[PDB]
Design an enzyme around this catalytic site. Structure first.
Site, PDB file in Angstrom:
ATOM      1  N   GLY A 114       0.821  -1.199   0.000  1.00 19.97           N
ATOM      2  CA  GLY A 114       0.000   0.000   0.000  1.00 19.97           C
ATOM      3  C   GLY A 114       0.862   1.259   0.000  1.00 19.97           C
ATOM      4  O   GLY A 114       2.062   1.197  -0.255  1.00 19.97           O
ATOM      5  N   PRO A 115       0.280   2.438   0.303  1.00 19.15           N
ATOM      6  CA  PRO A 115       1.056   3.679   0.358  1.00 19.15           C
ATOM      7  C   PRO A 115       2.064   3.648   1.510  1.00 19.15           C
ATOM      8  O   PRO A 115       1.865   2.909   2.472  1.00 19.15           O
ATOM      9  CB  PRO A 115      -0.015   4.753   0.613  1.00 19.15           C
ATOM     10  CG  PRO A 115      -1.335   4.085   0.269  1.00 19.15           C
ATOM     11  CD  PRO A 115      -1.144   2.628   0.616  1.00 19.15           C
ATOM     12  N   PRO A 116       3.183   4.414   1.456  1.00 14.36           N
ATOM     13  CA  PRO A 116       4.133   4.462   2.570  1.00 14.36           C
ATOM     14  C   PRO A 116       3.542   5.174   3.781  1.00 14.36           C
ATOM     15  O   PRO A 116       2.698   6.058   3.636  1.00 14.36           O
ATOM     16  CB  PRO A 116       5.305   5.292   2.027  1.00 14.36           C
ATOM     17  CG  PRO A 116       4.678   6.147   0.947  1.00 14.36           C
ATOM     18  CD  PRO A 116       3.609   5.266   0.333  1.00 14.36           C
ATOM     19  N   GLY A 117       4.002   4.758   4.965  1.00  9.70           N
ATOM     20  CA  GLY A 117       3.680   5.414   6.220  1.00  9.70           C
ATOM     21  C   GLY A 117       2.347   4.949   6.791  1.00  9.70           C
ATOM     22  O   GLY A 117       1.706   5.688   7.536  1.00  9.70           O
ATOM     23  N   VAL A 118       1.948   3.726   6.439  1.00  8.69           N
ATOM     24  CA  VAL A 118       0.655   3.209   6.858  1.00  8.69           C
ATOM     25  C   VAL A 118       0.844   2.308   8.072  1.00  8.69           C
ATOM     26  O   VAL A 118      -0.127   1.771   8.610  1.00  8.69           O
ATOM     27  CB  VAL A 118      -0.074   2.479   5.715  1.00  8.69           C
ATOM     28  CG1 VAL A 118      -0.642   3.452   4.691  1.00  8.69           C
ATOM     29  CG2 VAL A 118       0.811   1.430   5.054  1.00  8.69           C
ATOM     30  N   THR A 121       5.358  -1.571   8.525  1.00 11.82           N
ATOM     31  CA  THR A 121       6.627  -1.889   9.160  1.00 11.82           C
ATOM     32  C   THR A 121       6.421  -2.026  10.670  1.00 11.82           C
ATOM     33  O   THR A 121       7.003  -2.908  11.301  1.00 11.82           O
ATOM     34  CB  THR A 121       7.709  -0.870   8.762  1.00 11.82           C
ATOM     35  OG1 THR A 121       7.743  -0.748   7.338  1.00 11.82           O
ATOM     36  CG2 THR A 121       9.095  -1.226   9.254  1.00 11.82           C
ATOM     37  N   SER A 438      -7.639   4.553 -16.597  1.00 11.41           N
ATOM     38  CA  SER A 438      -8.760   4.734 -15.691  1.00 11.41           C
ATOM     39  C   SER A 438      -9.407   6.106 -15.866  1.00 11.41           C
ATOM     40  O   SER A 438     -10.569   6.280 -15.522  1.00 11.41           O
ATOM     41  CB  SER A 438      -8.343   4.507 -14.275  1.00 11.41           C
ATOM     42  OG  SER A 438      -7.894   3.171 -14.112  1.00 11.41           O
ATOM     43  N   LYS A 481      -8.871   5.739  -4.301  1.00 13.47           N
ATOM     44  CA  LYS A 481      -9.505   6.835  -5.021  1.00 13.47           C
ATOM     45  C   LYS A 481     -10.460   7.585  -4.103  1.00 13.47           C
ATOM     46  O   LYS A 481     -10.482   8.815  -4.096  1.00 13.47           O
ATOM     47  CB  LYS A 481     -10.231   6.337  -6.276  1.00 13.47           C
ATOM     48  CG  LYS A 481      -9.329   6.204  -7.492  1.00 13.47           C
ATOM     49  CD  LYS A 481      -9.880   5.352  -8.608  1.00 13.47           C
ATOM     50  CE  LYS A 481      -8.870   5.153  -9.719  1.00 13.47           C
ATOM     51  NZ  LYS A 481      -7.694   4.362  -9.282  1.00 13.47           N
TER      52      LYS A 481
END
Ligand code: ADP
Ligand code: ADP
Lengths: 532, 531, 168
Positions: A114-118, A121, A438, A481
């Site tokens: 997914g997106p970073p910083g979620v 980790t 899209s 989205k």
């Protein structure tokens, strides 16, 4: 020297006594150790033998972190660590249930993207502790070296093992949790691809018996819990991805972020600063203000920094004695972070004729963008396109343009505008190759808006591919989205009818505030985006 | 260093005692062992020398495990390991029969192509189990360096030999079964085409004097049963394509997948989780529903994951005391797998004018798509789209040319493809070889636009169309109709010659499809537009 | 390992016109082929000006790997013959082998390893060998056994090989 050869042997045995080796391994070590007991100490060969034996005896064979698992106990650990991620927590519960039922340790492969910083980790760290399993983190990244994992030949000068064996030495269980990072950005070149090597790491069959250049014995890794991290799933190598168990992790909206902040972020920055609530105070509105106008990403990566910044500033203030308690409010926040950075988000608050709003999936997360058109003036007309458009885009956009022409002349024959004239269209970058087509339908809306001299319906965001006949086709990355549309000040969204499944799988509060249309044909969108 | 030199020499002799090197290798072995005595055990070369000698001696030279085999026994192995693959079982037993006759490995080598997850690698494992033969697999998918095959010379940091040498060593035999997977995904090497290396491995006479960069000794490789896998047939280089005996491993239909599931997949998954067979009751209807609406894979790998999830969801309920017993029904399956993913089978149920059905095979097996056309306004001209090849364009050129002349025959008073600029669209993905097969479809598409009539509802067709209107035969009929059956298309038109392939299909495939075979395009017009 | 016989194949891949070369991708092979390609074209335009096969087409060419650096030039004329064979659409006078470097204006040049090359020819049982005039000395000086039963012509220009290889 003669008796000292003996003395070294039992020192190796005592390291091996409670570490019950496999049968084939036992034979290998016996051959090497009896060799060591005859070979002269001064020899470098002796040292190489000893080094090889050192690592072999140091491996915790038949030793496990006996997971004292309790299903509700582990659940609480996950909740006290992170907010949201209901889907992932359920999946982890299933893993715990599986291990309990077997009444023995088992190893599975689970990938997070997914997106970073979620916090993927950080979720990693949380899982290890919940299971009572040893934790380790590794990053393949852009490296092209196979020997990073496979190591070098033991008998060769200056022998070193791969990271897989290295970490297995420090961790004293057969079954650690290994974290692997940036599996999407695996490189290829001179030496090869690590993907070839780690194919042996993510294959159940090859996990039972795994070989390296260093230890040179088949070992059991089927008990090891492999967790991999990626940003976009498309770029992961086909064989690895297809075999891999794939879990989607989403970003966060206002309320979600806010929850994270209050519950987790602020206490974490207090720990780092050595501060307490009795000296530094933060209201919801402050963090709401901090979330709205100081961050853009779907993750909370920037938000940690801003919070860290404020508390950090306050620490200095406390020591100096400028004011003995610091309460941060919308009144006095300007001292801590300065004036608001992102005051506006819709770079067109009213969309002028021939501009549309698209929503796009990006590696960094859900992003809104605008598609713009322009005119540059019996003969045939033209389209010119710009942007970092791939071969795919060029083709899809031509189709858009073709459907545009026919749609308009069939709907309104008097309006020869689009066909007979030259049009510039620009599509902004950041759209990934697969998510590229899209915004096909938006493009077509763009042209027709340009055509009739009609501006689009305010605050309307869209997505969906368009066929030559004008069939709306399903698109991916719907989760991301919608989150983006929320922040972008959107009130109405228009999606494929095939995507109705994806939309309603979201939590209620996220989808709230947004009128949704599902469409199948373009005649429908035309009516929606131009009411009159 | 006392007994260091003697012990190393002696243990190698023990290794050489079983695995005796060829007669010309005596000197090489002795030379290395003698100069080992010269080198001090502190010297850098000594450590490298010991590795070289260890690697050399570890190879099972002239040593092979026994082979006991029977063709009838092989069929029993084949039957028990997998269901279906009637043609595939037939094809492989032919090679087994030929190999049994000669009692040695054929010059020709064996490769399999089909959709991912069909069981190509499973066949290889089954054949090894059938022959009571040792098995190893190394991948050549995505490789570009020949040195990967031949290893590196000993001076390299952490010197590593050829992969072929490795697999021989580990198997401890002269006659191993080796799976060389993803030969199709071979890279065209910049420093030199690995085609040369591949051809060395395929030819048994050339294998007798195989050389690497490490060992520098001609390996007397023979009787090694090379088995390969591919996805599509095009990407294999010309010299390697004809050098390979090729087998088509086709996809499966709903009923076929279910038997696989009931016999293999459910027990596999039950065993993997250690579940009770009573507590995790799984109905057949669920799996049929799962197949129809939750999966689009021709293979079983994607299906297998969804199946695992079903049983996985059940396991949680049992431990936690959520549910006393798990009874998987269509009504309550939503909790276990979630909402249906492909409630839509095929789009354009009502096919508009200027659209025609299209068929081919792809990397993923049997595929479906549509041809689309429209206008864009003294002369007329054609715009084509898709990521189409140069050959594809020419196919369309042929198609466009014929369409004009054909329209003249049917309706002279018309001038539609004559005085009009038309946009044509063809979806991509399909193999270049089978790419021109949409040719006739294209013609139907152009013609359909002409009078403004939709093609006869739920009508499918494919095949290469020549200049004279001749319908040329096409391969992989099994794949195309599998997709047609998925699509729920009732009428299929196919080339006349390919009637052989249709009647070669099993009963399930052929159910309820009114097929007709045709030679000229005018015959298809008889069906497409009788009115 | 010794003297060997190597095959040369040309194939059609179907203004513009090009030659695509395959096999060993050594630069010296490429340049020799380019020379050969252009001469063939040059030869064609005077011999049969009516035909424009080679001129208006993309042709694929393949050569086996069994060649030393000097052997690269050595197979010069063979390419030309093959190209003209493809152009005229007729195979050569049957069982004819040949070795020679060709200048861009078509004169033939010396080649190395005549001794080793002739052995392979006799082994493969060819009727005739045509060689450069400057290689004349080497052949007569060989062993007895190889000489009898071989038709030999000495050539200076490729015009000669054209008439030999193709009777009319
Ligand atoms: N849902 C969440 N609940 C609580 N904290 C979260 C959540 N998502 C992210 N965080 C916090 O975000 C921080 C940064 O996440 P990090 O793991 O570095 O990101 P990434 O997943 O991209 O590697 C962590 O310290 C973590 O506590
Ligand atoms: N017809 C079949 N019957 C039973 N099992 C099958 C069948 N086809 C595939 N499988 C299963 O496929 C799995 C692995 O498939 P694989 O060989 O990797 O497919 P592919 O070679 O097409 O990628 C095995 O566990 C095997 O049980």
């Amino acid at each position: 020297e003669k008796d000292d050869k003996d003395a070294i042997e039992e020192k190796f045995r005592e390291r091996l006594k409670e570490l019950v080796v496999p049968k084939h391994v036992m034979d290998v070590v016996d051959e090497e150790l009896s060799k060591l007991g005859l070979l002269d100490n001064h020899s470098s060969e002796f040292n190489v033998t000893r080094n090889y034996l050192d690592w072999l005896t140091s491996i915790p064979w038949g030793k496990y972190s006996n997971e004292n698992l309790d299903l509700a106990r582990a659940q609480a650990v996950l909740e006290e660590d992170h907010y949201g991620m209901e889907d992932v927590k359920k999946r982890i519960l299933e893993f715990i249930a599986v291990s309990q039922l077997r009444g023995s340790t088992q190893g599975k492969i689970l990938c997070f993207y997914g997106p970073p910083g979620v916090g993927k980790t950080s979720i990693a760290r949380s899982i290890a502790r919940a299971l009572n399993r040893e934790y380790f983190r590794f990053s393949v990244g852009g490296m092209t070296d196979v020997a990073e994992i496979k190591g070098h030949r033991w008998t060769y000068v200056g022998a070193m093992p791969g990271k897989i064996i290295q970490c297995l030495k420090k961790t004293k269980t057969e079954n650690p949790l290994i974290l692997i990072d940036e599996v999407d950005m695996i490189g290829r070149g001179y030496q090869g691809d690590p993907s070839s090597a780690l194919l042996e790491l993510l294959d159940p069959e090859q996990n039972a018996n795994f070989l390296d250049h260093y230890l040179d014995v088949p070992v059991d890794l089927s008990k090891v819990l492999f967790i991999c991290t990626a940003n976009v799933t498309d770029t992961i190598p086909e064989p690895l991805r297809d075999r891999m168990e794939m879990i989607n992790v989403s970003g966060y909206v206002a309320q979600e972020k806010l929850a994270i902040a209050e519950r987790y972020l602020v206490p974490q920055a207090r720990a780092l600063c050595g501060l307490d609530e009795s000296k530094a105070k933060l209201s919801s509105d402050v963090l709401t203000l901090l979330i709205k106008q100081y961050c853009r990403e779907s993750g909370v990566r920037n938000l940690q920094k801003q919070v860290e910044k404020v508390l950090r500033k306050s620490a200095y203030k406390i020591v100096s004695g400028e004011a003995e308690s610091v309460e941060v409010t919308p009144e006095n926040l300007q001292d801590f972070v300065g004036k608001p950075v992102f005051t506006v988000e819709r770079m067109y608050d009213v969309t002028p004729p021939g501009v549309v709003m698209g929503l796009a999936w990006t590696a960094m997360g859900g992003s809104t963008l605008f598609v713009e058109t322009s005119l540059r003036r019996d003969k045939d007309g033209s389209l010119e396109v710009t942007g970092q458009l791939g071969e795919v885009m060029k083709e899809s956009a031509r189709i858009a343009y073709t459907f545009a022409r026919a749609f308009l002349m069939q709907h309104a024959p008097a309006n020869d505008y689009l066909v007979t004239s030259h049009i510039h269209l620009h599509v902004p970058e950041g759209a990934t190759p697969k998510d590229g087509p899209s915004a096909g339908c938006t493009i077509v809306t763009a042209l027709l808006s340009l055509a009739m001299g009609r501006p689009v319906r305010q605050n309307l965001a869209m997505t969906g591919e368009v066929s030559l006949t004008g069939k709306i086709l399903p698109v991916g990355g719907i989760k991301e989205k919608t989150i983006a549309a929320k922040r972008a000040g959107v009130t109405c969204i228009v999606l494929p009818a095939e995507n109705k499944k994806d939309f309603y799988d979201l939590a209620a509060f996220i989808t709230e505030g947004l009128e949704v249309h599902f469409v199948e044909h373009y005649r429908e969108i035309f009516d929606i985006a131009f009411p009159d």
